[PDB]
RNA sequence: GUCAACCGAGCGUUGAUCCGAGGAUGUCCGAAUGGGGAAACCCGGCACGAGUGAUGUCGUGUCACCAGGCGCUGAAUAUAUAGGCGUCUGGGGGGAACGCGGGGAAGUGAAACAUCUCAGUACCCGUAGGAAGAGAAAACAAAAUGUGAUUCCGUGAGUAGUGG
RNA sequence: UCCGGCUCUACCUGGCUGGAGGGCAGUGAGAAAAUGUUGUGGUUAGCGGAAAUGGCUUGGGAUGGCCUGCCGUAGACGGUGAGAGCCCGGUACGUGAAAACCCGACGUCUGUCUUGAUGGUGUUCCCGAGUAGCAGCGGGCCCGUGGAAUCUGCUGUGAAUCUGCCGGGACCACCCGGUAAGCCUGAAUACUUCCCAGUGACCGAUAGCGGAUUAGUACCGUGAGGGAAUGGUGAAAAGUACCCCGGGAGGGGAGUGAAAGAGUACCUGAAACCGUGCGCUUACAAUCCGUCAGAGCCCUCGACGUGUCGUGGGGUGAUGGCGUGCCUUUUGAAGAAUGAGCCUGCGAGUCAGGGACAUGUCGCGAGGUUAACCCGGGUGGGGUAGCCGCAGCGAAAGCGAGUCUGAAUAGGGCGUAUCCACACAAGAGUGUGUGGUGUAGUGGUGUGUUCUGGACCCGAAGCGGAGUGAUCUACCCAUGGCCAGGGUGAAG
RNA sequence: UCAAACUCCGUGAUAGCUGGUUCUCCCCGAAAUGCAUUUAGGUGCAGCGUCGCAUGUUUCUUGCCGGAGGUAGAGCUACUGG
RNA sequence: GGGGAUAAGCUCCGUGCGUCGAGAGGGAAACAGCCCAGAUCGCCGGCUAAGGCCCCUAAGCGUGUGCUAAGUGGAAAAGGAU
RNA sequence: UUGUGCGCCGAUAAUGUAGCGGGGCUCAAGCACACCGCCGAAGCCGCGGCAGCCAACGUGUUGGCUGGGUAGGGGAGCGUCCUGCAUCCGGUGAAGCCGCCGAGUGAUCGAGUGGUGGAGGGUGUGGGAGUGAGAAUGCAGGCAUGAGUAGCGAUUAGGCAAGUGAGAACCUUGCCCGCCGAAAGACCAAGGGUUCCUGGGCCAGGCCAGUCCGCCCAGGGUGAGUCGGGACCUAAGGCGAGGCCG
RNA sequence: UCAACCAUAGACUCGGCGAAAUUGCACUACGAGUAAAGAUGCUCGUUACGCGCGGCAGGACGAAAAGACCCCGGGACCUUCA
RNA sequence: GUGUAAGUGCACAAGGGAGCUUGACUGCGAGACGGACAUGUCGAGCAGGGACGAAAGUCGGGACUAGUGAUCCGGCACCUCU
């Protein structure tokens, strides 16, 4: 009837300590210290999975804006223009264009220039 | 235990009176079950009742006229009720108590 | 409360530095008392006569419908056990691994004969039960046994 | 062993046919010199137990 | 014999080693019992026997206490007794639980607490037995024409009741 | 039944004291000792006991796999170089006791009634004395002094013998039962220091008896008293002969061995922990020590081509952004509130019980179910004493689908499974009388809570009983010893 | 070690007290209020939660009609007081 | 609204008012209760709220008309002053 | 002289600017009013997977709503041990352990394969639990940080040559030197129990090392008419025949 | 006042033996501020080459002791015309 | 002014006064309030037997709200209960 407990614990110990090969100190040897850091770690991964979207989008925007401003148009009015023109390309791909092919991006810039309102600060 | 306030089982009055240890509880039978387990009618004693399983074995029996009575029965019990007296009188039977 | 010793507070309550302890045989020690342990107890439970007999009749029906209830007058020639006889006869009558045998008390020779076989598990019909039936595949009644069983139950 | 019963709950609580619980009522014994009779009259009889104490009283009566 | 080998020297078909029942021997302490004593060690008496030129020494036994029976005596003191002397038989202490008689708590519960409870438990005492104790109606019962020693189990019953 | 003598005495009777056939009984509780036969009656050692060197292969070893046979009143168990019915030990079964011990059996031996009984008939005598009873304090009986019987303990007082006395819950009268104060009495029942044989949905070296190992030992304490730790080579020691370094330990070769990643520190041999090598990275940097993006270098798989991207994967990871340990307890803790040095192992809602309530499931169904116990190698059969339901109201008598209160059908309370259909009355809230539909409880088990018990676990200070302690220290007793040397100069 | 030693036993004493209580997921999901309390840090019942059965929108929201209030405000030769 | 000094991050009541408790994420320089919004998991997709667009920090040294001269903005009273 | 919108002085604390979050800003990057766009969250939408309640239909498909969560209530499951029953693998190498490659929504899994190793295990259904530890100033064993740090036990003080020895500050001897000398000297009692001598020995011990030692092993060794006690006596006190009390 | 010098035992260096209490972690700065109202760990800025040794003792609310003062609950012992 | 504090009411008087007088009763009680629970408050209407009044009708204490204390244990009178 008496049930030694060895196996039933060893299992999860093995799991965790496999999943902490790279940590630095008592976070890489000891179950009671790596468990905690696994909590914090998985949590920070979750949060970063939700937020790398905004990170990349920020990046894409900075690239777009600098490209445009070297072609003498602002970001805000560029996107006003593409919205007006019904153009569909997203920012990841506008940035890819900016990097690789600035010519096509300048063409899109010119489209927006054409399709913007005349008197941008009008009361309409 | 109720905090400290005098509980329900210590602030209500006690029930009134006593028991009369020498009480004679009778065990009843009603005429409904007679009619429901004696189609042929006839003599019905304590053992005839014990057979059909309407009372206990060490019973001291009483008879009562709840249900209908059209069968004829020569009932034997200890004590009756006037309703059974009259119902047996109407169905033409022998209410010969002990 | 049954272990040896422990009936003295091993050291102070305060001043020591170490924890608080009241006996040297408490559970958290090494040599200490089991807490909620096994105890000598009974395991029987009171199943009723009607449920039991319903079980047995249903079981015999389960075997009968599938034609596994065989009868027999005897397993042997006069008053000299010989397991080779009974084994050959069960080979004639059966090929399955396991089997039940119902032989009365007086007919001791059949019991003594068939006892030693690997599969067989002999029984008297006065202690006829359900586990011993269901574990089997075939069931060999004696005729005396059937008659006793039937005229004992049926009245 | 068995579950022993509560004396007070047996002496100040009974059960009817359909399982109701019954009690008597209070302020009836003494100091009647000034209690009007209507007040003395709604306190007679028996009364069905409340809801809130039914359970407690079951647990006291039975075991 | 063994942990536990090593060495030496032996026995055994003429029946060993081994197993079982009965006997014998059975140092000293221990109820311990000749006296004494810090338990396992100090000193003796009496009868016999061994031994020395004699003493010393040695061996075998036996010597406590009470209760009872028997036997001799009957102090102050007259009867006569307690007592004293001899002999015979018992008891003496140990034990794991179980039993019967007696004594006999407290923490606890009561959300305090004294009555109550814990428990007549633990423990202590005196005595036993293989089991004990109880046990033959100065009993129950309720007019039933009933039962017929006692004890232990099931139920009645967590009831009738008792109770700050 | 015959006689011997006896009733003081010779004689008639009645009544004793003896022996004899006999009967009854016996080591009985009813009196007690030994006797000798005596039972394959029992215990105290044991013994025989069926059947394969079977074949091929594996392997160090076959007891394995596969294929061939056999025994079986014996395939229970264990061991043997790896799971063995056919190897061994032993089992089923049958055997066996010179001696001692226990059961009865006997014949001795011992008594014991026999000299006897059934019934008649009218009155005197006896029927257990400091007791029973009564009073006063008390114990225990369901019963806490209460109206409190019966049973009893100490004191004080204190009766009768059958028209007597004690009890039937104060007490009195009637009836009933029984005959105290003298004594023994088996069987059913409880228990295991020890012994014998077995079983296990019990443990398997931090467990299990505290004790698999010298275990109540070592060690601690003055003392009572506490009270530990340590199992495993391998099939068998074949335990490394010999050589080399070294003072030796210890090791390297040579060997044994199936394996020395089995060397008397030895089955396997984890983690913490301690180090050696190989790749990346790190000395201008402010880091709950990580995560998301990711340069660069190193390893690898694959399609190709003289080296080369890829629906890749893995280790490191410059640099950037984000980011305030874990638990408990707190309104609120990253918290400078508590706890944790780390690893490994151990450590807390459990069991009983026809217990209670609620709920699932199963059998039965107006019935349901047994307890103790008896028989059973087993888990099975029986056992009706009991309990729950089937009618309640009422303090109770008592009555009864109604009942209680009350003067009352006059209202109400409780109850009449529930619904259904038609009526009559009112819409003061619906009721009342009919008809049919017809009532569901109980016993196992599982879960949850719960009651009594140590009742989820650990933790006091401190209460009580019985004993150990004055060798330390407090005081006293008995008996001995110690206080260098120099000054002052009382009485007389 | 002494405002009443020590040891064994009762005894696993008891604490309205502190701490601790181990694997996973799915669904719903609070309170910190009231009366009482030898009671205020605890507990009993009601409150709010869920599970099961029953009753089916009875809850809630908006509009319209009906109803009492004596609050803000204002008022005082409309009372009591300044 | 009471007590308090009409002080307290004070204390005590109300409230189909809220949030925290038990609730993350964004903004508030960091900040349980404030504003927005109530997280089934993934995506190197898009639009918005509160808030904000010179660089740090992604987004406007945005348009138009006027004020500010004090680094006011980016603490403050009675009162004083062409 | 009124009312306004921004403004000035009043203005004033102690580690360091320090009452914009910083740089910096009036060539507003500051206040107000209107206008234009934009960024921005785990919100909403978009593409996908799971799940709960209800509903519709057909022999489990779809759809709408829903899915933060502590105390807590309810539901469904993995894993460990022993077992009843049926079958499978196993000295042609099970378990256990280290792994690699992979899987599952999770507890977890590999009948998927390598190394080590040497004898029992798995599967499905039921049964029963000493049934899952990270914390109790928790218990037992082992090992770390502090740390190769503090100390190495008095106020007497050691030295040179030679010696054996593998190895010498310390062990043996020689000559010096210094210490106590009403004691740190010689003799008894209590108490301890072989510590004494000889021979051999140095993996443990000695606070270093050690050829040395009260350490280890073996052997040896204590001799009483007169010594200190008994056989001789008694005090304090004890035990206490009989005995008295209880 | 007003402190200076000297010698020994230590302390420092070398050779040997070799512990300890304590400890969630770690490549452990300062400031103004925010916060459970006294921050090595947060924000915004400033400073700083890695690793050691002797030494001081401001902080780490430093180590030790489940506060000894206070309050609550339970006990204990002591007193008294309870 | 209302017996006694305050409020709500009272001139339609519940204020003041005079005559009879005992309902300062018995047996009940629909439906309701308030409600943790026990307590607490009103209550039309029915019956006997009455008061007052010519009758209708009112009277089960006081203009209303305070004026008292649960349960247990005992005591007194009556009962056709044991």
Curated annotation (Swiss-Prot), chain A:
PROSITE patterns xrefs: RIBOSOMAL_L20
Alphabetical UniProt keywords: Ribonucleoprotein, Ribosomal protein, RNA-binding, rRNA-binding
UniProt cross-references to SUPFAM superfamilies, sorted A to Z: Ribosomal protein L20
GO CC terms of this entry: ribonucleoprotein complex; ribosome
GO-annotated molecular function: rRNA binding; structural constituent of ribosome
Pfam families: Ribosomal_L20
GO biological process: ribosomal large subunit assembly; translation
Family: Belongs to the bacterial ribosomal protein bL20 family.
Protein purpose: Binds directly to 23S ribosomal RNA and is necessary for the in vitro assembly process of the 50S ribosomal subunit. It is not involved in the protein synthesizing functions of that subunit.
Protein name from the UniProt record: Large ribosomal subunit protein bL20
Curated annotation (Swiss-Prot), chain C:
GO terms (BP aspect): translation
Transmembrane segment boundaries: none
Disulfide bonds: none
Superkingdom per UniProt: Bacteria
Alphabetized UniProt keyword annotations: Ribonucleoprotein, Ribosomal protein, RNA-binding, rRNA-binding
Gene Ontology molecular-function annotations: rRNA binding; structural constituent of ribosome
This protein's GO CC annotations: ribonucleoprotein complex; ribosome
Span list, region Disordered: 1-45
Family: Belongs to the universal ribosomal protein uL4 family.
Oligomeric and partner information: Part of the 50S ribosomal subunit.
Role: One of the primary rRNA binding proteins, this protein initially binds near the 5'-end of the 23S rRNA. It is important during the early stages of 50S assembly. It makes multiple contacts with different domains of the 23S rRNA in the assembled 50S subunit and ribosome. Forms part of the polypeptide exit tunnel.
Protein name, UniProt field: Large ribosomal subunit protein uL4
From-to range in the entire protein, with total length: 56 to 210 of 215
Swiss-Prot record, chain D:
Keyword Zinc in record: no
Keyword Ribosomal protein: yes
Keywords from the UniProt entry: Ribonucleoprotein, Ribosomal protein
Pfam families, alphabetized: Ribosomal_L35p
Family annotation (InterPro entries): Ribosomal_bL35 (IPR001706), Ribosomal_bL35-like (IPR021137), Ribosomal_bL35_CS (IPR018265), Ribosomal_bL35_sf (IPR037229)
Gene Ontology CC: one annotated term: cytosolic large ribosomal subunit
GO biological process, one term: translation
GO molecular function, one term: structural constituent of ribosome
Positions of disulphide bridges: none
Compositional bias of kind Polar residues: 47-57
Annotated Basic residues bias: 1-41
Chain residue ranges for the region called Disordered: 1-63
Family: Belongs to the bacterial ribosomal protein bL35 family.
PANTHER family hit by this protein: 54S RIBOSOMAL PROTEIN BL35M, LARGE RIBOSOMAL SUBUNIT PROTEIN BL35M
Protein name, UniProt field: Large ribosomal subunit protein bL35
């Amino acid at each position: 009837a008496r049930v030694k407990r060895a196996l039933n614990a060893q299992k999860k110990r093995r799991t965790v300590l496999k999943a902490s090969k790279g940590y630095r100190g008592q976070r890489s040897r000891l179950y009671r210290k790596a468990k905690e850091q696994q909590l914090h770690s998985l949590t920070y991964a979750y949060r970063d999975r939700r937020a790398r979207k905004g990170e990349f989008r920020k990046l894409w925007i900075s690239r777009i804006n600098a490209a445009a401003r070297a072609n003498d148009i602002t970001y805000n009015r560029l996107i006003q223009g593409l919205k007006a023109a019904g153009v569909e390309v997203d920012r990841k791909n506008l940035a890819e264009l900016a990097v690789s092919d600035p010519a096509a991006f300048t063409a899109l810039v010119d489209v927006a220039r054409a399709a913007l309102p005349e008197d941008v600060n009008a009361p309409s | 235990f109720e905090g400290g306030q005098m509980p329900i089982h210590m602030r209500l009055p006690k029930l009134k009176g006593f028991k009369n240890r020498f009480r004679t509880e009778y065990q009843v039978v009603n005429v409904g079950d007679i009619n429901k387990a004696f189609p042929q009618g006839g003599t019905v004693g304590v053992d005839e009742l014990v057979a059909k399983g309407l009372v206990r074995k060490n019973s001291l029996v009483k008879v009562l006229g709840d249900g209908k009575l059209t069968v004829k029965v020569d009932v034997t019990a200890n004590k009756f009720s006037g309703s059974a007296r009259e119902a047996i009188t109407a169905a033409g039977g022998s209410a010969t108590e002990l | 409360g049954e272990v040896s010793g422990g009936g003295k507070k091993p050291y102070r309550q305060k001043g020591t530095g170490r924890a608080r302890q009241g006996s040297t045989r408490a559970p958290q020690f090494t040599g200490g008392g089991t807490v909620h342990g096994p105890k000598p107890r009974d395991y029987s439970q009171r199943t009723p006569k009607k449920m039991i007999a319903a079980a047995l009749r249903g079981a015999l029906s389960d075997r009968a419908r599938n034609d596994r209830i065989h009868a027999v007058t005897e397993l042997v020639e006069g008053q000299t056990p010989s397991t080779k006889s009974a084994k050959t006869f069960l080979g004639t009558l059966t090929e399955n691994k396991k089997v039940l045998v119902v032989i009365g008390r007086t007919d001791e020779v059949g019991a003594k004969s068939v006892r030693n076989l690997p599969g067989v598990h002999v029984i008297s019909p006065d202690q006829l039960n359900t586990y011993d039936v269901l574990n089997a595949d075939d069931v060999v009644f004696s005729v005396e046994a059937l008659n006793a069983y039937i005229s004992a139950n049926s009245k | 062993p068995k579950a022993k019963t509560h004396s007070g709950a047996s002496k100040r609580f009974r059960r009817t046919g359909t399982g109701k619980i019954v009690r008597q009522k209070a302020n009836r014994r003494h100091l009647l010199e000034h209690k009007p009779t209507k007040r003395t009259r709604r306190l007679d009889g028996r009364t069905t137990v409340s809801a809130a104490d039914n359970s407690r009283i079951n647990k006291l009566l039975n075991g």
